[PDB]
Amino acid sequence: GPEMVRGQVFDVGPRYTNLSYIGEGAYGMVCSAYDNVNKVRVAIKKISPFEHQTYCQRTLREIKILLRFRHENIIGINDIIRAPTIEQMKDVYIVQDLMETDLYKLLKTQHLSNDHICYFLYQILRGLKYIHSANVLHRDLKPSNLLLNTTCDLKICDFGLARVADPDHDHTGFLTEYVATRWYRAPEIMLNSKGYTKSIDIWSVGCILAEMLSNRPIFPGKHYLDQLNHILGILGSPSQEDLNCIINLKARNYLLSLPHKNKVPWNRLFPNADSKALDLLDKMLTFNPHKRIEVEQALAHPYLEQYYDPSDEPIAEAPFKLPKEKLKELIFEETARFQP
Numbered sequence: 001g002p003e004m005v006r007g008q009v010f011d012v013g014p015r016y017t018n019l020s021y022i023g024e025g026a027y028g029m030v031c032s033a034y035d036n037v038n039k040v041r042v043a044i045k046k047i048s049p050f051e052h053q054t055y056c057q058r059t060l061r062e063i064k065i066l067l068r069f070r071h072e073n074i075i076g077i078n079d080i081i082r083a084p085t086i087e088q089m090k091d092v093y094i095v096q097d098l099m100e101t102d103l104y105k106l107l108k109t110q111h112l113s114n115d116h117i118c119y120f121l122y123q124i125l126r127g128l129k130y131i132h133s134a135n136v137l138h139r140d141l142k143p144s145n146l147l148l149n150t151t152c153d154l155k156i157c158d159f160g161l162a163r164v165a166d167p168d169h170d171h172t173g174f175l176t177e178y179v180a181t182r183w184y185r186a187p188e189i190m191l192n193s194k195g196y197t198k199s200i201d202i203w204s205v206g207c208i209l210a211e212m213l214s215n216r217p218i219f220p221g222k223h224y225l226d227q228l229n230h231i232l233g234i235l236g237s238p239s240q241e242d243l244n245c246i247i248n249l250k251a252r253n254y255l256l257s258l259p260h261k262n263k264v265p266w267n268r269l270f271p272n273a274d275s276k277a278l279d280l281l282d283k284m285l286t287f288n289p290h291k292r293i294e295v296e297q298a299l300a301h302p303y304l305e306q307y308y309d310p311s312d313e314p315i316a317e318a319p320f321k322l323p324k325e326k327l328k329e330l331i332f333e334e335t336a337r338f339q340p
């Protein structure tokens, strides 16, 4: 019979033994196990998406992206376990490298040295260069999606909200609902953006840098619109030029209705930070997304001079450009290479 964990089927087969519960993911239980072929412990996510089109779409997109990508700073998929036939397939199990920790757990307990902040930021941006070069947006960068091994090598994980970039279709109305983690949302999400531009990810990286400098989230909004008031409470009121860039009247008039808010100087919020780190932070946390630094510029910033080497910051060879029954078929096909 199958391996059981907490009374539930976790059917990973004889390759993977000595299971240990980790937690609940979006579509199922997550465990670690021992890989008897590669002789290391691995992470395994159980995914049961087939009852809903949206679950199928997020699962298929992540599988397609991660199987195409190959980069040192991006988690891979090592194996995918599923039944031999579509009729018998109800779950899929995704096997990935098991890391030591994530940046969320590290920031809860550990002060980061400036050298560690620098190195972590370099690797995040190196991975993001590759993602963005493939015309993909991650859309949910945050500390728990940054994994670290025992020597502080970093991998970006969780492409369950990723999308192909679509800057020509980014505009939306004021107060449009959004899926990604609140605290890392750029201001434009709450104003006029669907999060279909690369600048969405740079904002989230800027939030992560701020969180590495102080061990606390910089903009911990409690609800949708509070997120924007946190952002404006530090950046201050937008300039006329930046407001003029927001054509949507409801969004612009919301911003015009607010009392004046002063900018909080970065060196006052982060009195212990390197001055070059704060200059780069300022450029990532720029209100106007068109003025916000892009990933390659960030890599070239003086803060990262010890690491920057564009020849060793690879790009993707092959950038990217339905009812649930059809999506089940595509998942079955996309996972076929892992069958014996």
Ligand SMILES: *CCC(=O)N1CCC[C@H]1c1c(-c2ccncc2)n[nH]c1C
Residues within 6 Å of the ligand: 022, 030, 043, 045, 075, 096, 097, 098, 099, 100, 101, 102, 144, 145, 147, 157, 158
């Ligand atoms: C995106 C990360 C993910 O999906 N994981 C599922 C299990 C946790 C996480 C993961 C780790 C990890 C190890 C130790 N501490 C935190 C996270 N290592 N690999 C994965 C896939």
